[PDB]
Design a protein around this ligand. Structure first.
Ligand SMILES: *[C@@H]1O[C@H](CO)[C@@H](O)[C@H](O)[C@H]1NC(C)=O
Ligand SMILES: *[C@@H]1O[C@H](CO)[C@@H](O)[C@H](O)[C@H]1NC(C)=O
Ligand SMILES: *[C@@H]1O[C@H](CO)[C@@H](O)[C@H](O)[C@H]1NC(C)=O
Ligand SMILES: *[C@@H]1O[C@H](CO)[C@@H](O)[C@H](O)[C@H]1NC(C)=O
Ligand SMILES: *[C@@H]1O[C@H](CO)[C@@H](O)[C@H](O)[C@H]1NC(C)=O
Ligand SMILES: *[C@@H]1O[C@H](CO)[C@@H](O)[C@H](O)[C@H]1NC(C)=O
Ligand SMILES: *[C@@H]1O[C@H](CO)[C@@H](O)[C@H](O)[C@H]1NC(C)=O
Ligand SMILES: *[C@@H]1O[C@H](CO)[C@@H](O)[C@H](O)[C@H]1NC(C)=O
Lengths: 371, 371, 371, 371
């Protein structure tokens, strides 16, 4: 697959920053990209190269062929519930349709850099900070801001000229088997494991910080995550609570090393919220931090994550609903006020089709410098 | 892929029955098969045709090639934690190893018939009954007995001569994308949706009856299931409770039609347990039945399921643990006494590597005839 | 003695079958019972009615008295090394104890029928078939499956209301003098002779088919049995041999009449093994059969046995070790590879306390129909 | 039961001796008695008190009754194949009959003393010596000379006035349940365990020295016996061999203590044969002795036996054939030249109905003094 011509890819500009303890914060000429899978792809004669997410065997038998055969076109971000305003990103879960009422558009964005390659965030011994407006996201919705260890140029090769410009080469701790594994038509039917740091993953009812360490072969699927509600702080993060989701708040995640510097060794992942200028106090005394990561032991607990954060990671924006378990693992039962049923997407579409996440002012750098 | 020669496939015999209201129950010359994926596969020179679950591109580029190239060998069921004794099946979650301690063998069996093709259970307007010993399965384990609408001969074609004799062609409501989709090397990378009736799915702490209706294109992932605990009957099914998992009990599922006969139209799925000869009373008054199936609406709620049960379905034995969500959806939170952590497989392996399910006396037929 | 109340008698269910050449095999609602002697018996005040296997003279002076005085309680089959799974019976020779290590529990079971009376097998001119796993039984152990001509209701009278529900009225060719002879306190001190057909009697090292004919007064103690090893076939039945005890095999015994039908006259007892689906060839050419029965002459050789098999016989499951002659008569010397000492129970307990027999899929009926 | 009147009991005189190292051997006015069970017993009106070895319930309901009701008569020793000539006892296995040919008379004698009570042999730290003529006893016959720890007056009580004069109160390591247990009608149906020293037990083909230690409750059924043939000396004891059974030989058994005197502690049982005046050499180097008695451990190995030999034991003469196992345990297989079949009593009766044992010159006393 190579760049198409019917619809040009014009990346929605999003301004991010890199703060240094001394030289403040610098504006970055970044932007967002829609994940490869959401695009239109076809041969010169316009027959589709895809078939229900899979490929057209005739046009896509091996790799060298689609490479020379198919073209993946750009998208209409607006129509995809993706919009930007300076240093602000707004993602919708649904969009009105010509046909019926609302169709579930579920964007998955990547922070692209000016050179046409994913911004390589190196957060080891540093901090990433942003503003969120989860007010819209109700029970069942999943707003998401996480780092994945993807190839900076979306694994673009001789047969994939699209690359990061078209969101090629996704991956996460779940080790997904994909039609296009790392920029190549996965002809070996293998999964794709890569480190995944899940900074924000939640809605207006609850949230969760979850680190996933990895081997070349596998990952820590169930992460050693932190959820105030799950940890018995049922009245900290929520509508009108300590953090108060009803309004905008700031999420500050610091990756602490043993030598206290980016030079090496991850030791803890410190979370600190702050709303209305004033710093919000921790849920658990001493600080909301992820020190020991039991689950990750079998994959080089923490050690590997930090090495991954050093090598550099891609930023991933996403909002989605669970048609299978209604995201109960995130906001229901013992980890959220939501009821087992309340998260049903159909019910979300019914009572709040206007749900959207609004990420704003994304800036990473030295600890304390991003503020 | 075709039948191998290094290890012959000798199916573990399991005696099932077909009861008629008048002529009692008849012994069936059935047996169990291990799912295609657990087997060894290679070319004539012994290079493997698989690569981490995927395929060897060189030996497996298209379909006609593996067909003529690879051979899938049989397995050592005992070594796979699968054993049978007359009308009794015993499945282990782990097995001791030459190398380390225990390796997680997770069998997935299919009821094979004497002719070398899956037993086509036609449960519409009838009943399937069996005995279970969930005593071993603790928090996190998932004992499983469900019907899937698979091709009776595992989609065996000109390139797949193995077929049902080697557990070819699996599928379920989850619509899994597989390396071998319906007996053919999935060269189009498409999922495989098929109706899935989940009769038993649980451990010694909780359980769940869940029907999944389907379209040719999709299925009802989140089923309109029933879980006594979830439905607010926290002291009905459990160790020392009304049903009492600590001992063996009987699970009787009846598929009721409107004309009261196999002739047509599914209307409700009635569940009735009985232990120690005496019939156990319902959890909810009037009978533990699945009448309305809300979720399934978008796929021909109930209607489709019954038509599927009429066409005939394959029986699937399985026991597995969740490395990602610790099966919390089944036995934790609001649907089980188990704690969020308690289901971790590593913790299962630690405190009870001997977990096993023992399905016994499987007999299906007219209502009341199987007893 | 009458039914007790402290421990209720709940029979372990075991599924057997009755096959007809035309109508296949039908499931039977049978079960197993523990022999009268293994039970607890006491008066209303809880003083025991037994004294080292004998009786308490004061509570048990005649018959009318114990009848009205003593109650025999039920047992904990599990604790007695007796367990069933559908159509499968597993009997242990020892069980761990609260006190010391292992205590020698030696079950003796009877196939009980739904009506509360022993299943009356009528094997004349027919066949009984089953599956055995002698792998556990080493030198010295005696796995056993034999028919005894006992009273269908364990000789239950006005003073014995327990009957077959409590394994009353045992007997065999050995003509044992018992404390309870045919349901009555043997106040005349007489033995109890009854026909005894010994189908399986052996371990993993050797075995023996032995018919015992009887008069009202006596029996053919030394039977005209058949033992491949004894008959000079030292490499037919054993670990890794033709029959191969290390794995499960099938034992098929056919009682051939002169008119070829159940109508009458026993002529020969044909034995035929089959393992792994394939039929195993005979040890001696022409067929492993018991034609002439020299010993039985003085008791109506064969003739009487057949008449006995016609009247109906009770099935007896049993596993035991010989503290006196180490079962040498069965597996040592000229009738087995075992050494004179090797069968010592103490030595069995030491090197293999886990010995157990697993009888499975018991079905009797027309010749060839049980398969 | 009390002494009868129809047939008076006249004991066949047998001269034994007591040798002292200094004062030579003294003649004893001993005699032999036939075991209680071989006698005729009836009430005053002549109805029998026995029924096939058991008792007549009406005449024998309790103990006080038979005591006052039944009379056990004496016997015709000659007719019982029992004859004595000075210091010589001759016992036949069969006797010609008025009716058919030969009836199997199988005497069991006890050495009675002048006072009307069993001779209490105290063999601890001493020696018993005798002459045997096993020439007649062929394969299958069992000549026997053993000590049993019976009550000197056959347990004679208020209801049994017969006592030792009529061979009352037998017992052995086999712990036999008897109609008359220790002189009383066994109304409790209990066995009778007592120490049993088996000095000679064999025929013209092989033999066996076997000690049985006992608890009050049980005994060492399988004794820690010695059989030259079994111990791999197939050409020592037999027709024309080292010992040469074809002619008369002497059996000398010495019970060695640690203090070397009757004062205490059994340590070993030394066997030494001598024929034709010359002393026969041992089978195994160092001496044919029973040092360690493994089996007897659970019953106070050796220790108990010696204490028993000190308390005093009754002498038992006996010759019998095995209708069940043809005495194979004694002279066939790995413990004798005899074939499995060769020991059949019917075959004995056929080819040698004249078998008889001839015990002669029985003398016990200090070691070496009996010669
Ligand atoms: C697949 O490709 C062939 C040939 O280009 C075309 O005829 C067919 O319509 C395509 N399938 C789809 C779903 O576009
Ligand atoms: C993805 O493909 C690019 C192509 O060069 C490669 O550099 C990168 O290492 C690949 N990633 C993995 C995990 O194979
Ligand atoms: C794949 O096949 C090629 C050629 O048969 C072979 O060289 C290679 O080792 C195979 N790969 C694996 C993992 O077996
Ligand atoms: C699976 O393949 C067989 C091959 O003939 C076919 O009959 C069956 O319909 C296929 N199933 C699906 C869902 O395509
Ligand atoms: C026998 O019965 C009597 C009276 O019931 C009682 O005192 C005695 O303890 C019993 N004996 C045993 C061993 O239970
Ligand atoms: C056992 O007792 C029952 C009681 O009626 C009787 O029918 C049966 O014949 C008896 N058996 C013998 C051998 O006496
Ligand atoms: C038992 O005793 C009764 C009464 O004395 C008598 O009628 C009966 O014949 C006796 N039985 C035998 C076998 O002698
Ligand atoms: C046998 O009975 C007599 C009667 O007094 C007694 O002295 C002796 O101890 C009894 N033996 C046993 C073992 O009870």
């Amino acid at each position: 697959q190579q760049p198409g011509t019917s619809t040009p890819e014009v990346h929605p500009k999003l301004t991010t920053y890199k703060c240094t303890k001394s030289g403040g914060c610098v504006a970055q000429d970044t932007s967002v990209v829609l994940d490869w899978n959401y695009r239109w792809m076809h041969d010169a004669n316009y027959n589709s190269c895809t078939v229900n997410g899979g490929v057209n065997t005739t046009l896509c038998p091996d790799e060298a062929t689609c490479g020379k055969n198919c073209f993946i076109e750009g998208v209409d971000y607006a129509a995809s519930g993706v919009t930007t305003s300076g240093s602000s990103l707004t993602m919708n879960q649904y969009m009105p349709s010509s046909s019926g009422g609302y169709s579930s558009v579920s964007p998955r964005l990547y922070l692209l850099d000016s050179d046409g390659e994913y911004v390589m965030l190196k957060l080891n011994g540093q901090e990433l900070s942003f503003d969120v407006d989860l007010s819209a996201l109700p029970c069942g919705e999943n707003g998401s801001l996480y780092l994945s260890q993807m190839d900076e140029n979306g694994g673009a090769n001789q047969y994939n000229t699209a690359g990061a410009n078209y969101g090629s080469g996704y991956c996460d701790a779940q080790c997904p088997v994909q039609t296009w594994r790392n920029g190549t038509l996965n002809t070996s039917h293998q999964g794709f494991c890569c480190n995944e740091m899940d900074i924000l993953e939640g809605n207006s009812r609850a949230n969760a910080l979850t680190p996933h360490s990895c081997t070349a072969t596998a990952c820590d699927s169930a992460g050693c995550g932190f959820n105030p509600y799950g940890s018995g702080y049922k009245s900290y993060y929520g509508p009108g609570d300590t953090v108060d989701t009803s309004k905008t708040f700031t999420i500050i995640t610091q990756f602490n090393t043993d030598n206290g510097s980016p030079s090496g060794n991850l030791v803890s992942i410190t979370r600190k919220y702050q709303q209305n200028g004033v710093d919000i106090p921790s849920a658990q005394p001493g600080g909301d931090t992820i020190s020991s990561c039991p689950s990750a032991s079998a994959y080089g607990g923490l050690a590997t994550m930090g090495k991954a954060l050093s090598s550099g990671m891609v930023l991933v924006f996403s909002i989605w609903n669970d048609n299978s378990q209604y995201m109960n693992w995130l906001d229901s039962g013992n980890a959220g006020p939501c009821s087992s049923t309340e998260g049903n997407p159909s019910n979300i579409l019914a009572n709040n089709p206007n749900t959207h996440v609004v990420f704003s002012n994304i800036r990473w750098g030295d600890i304390g410098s991003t503020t």
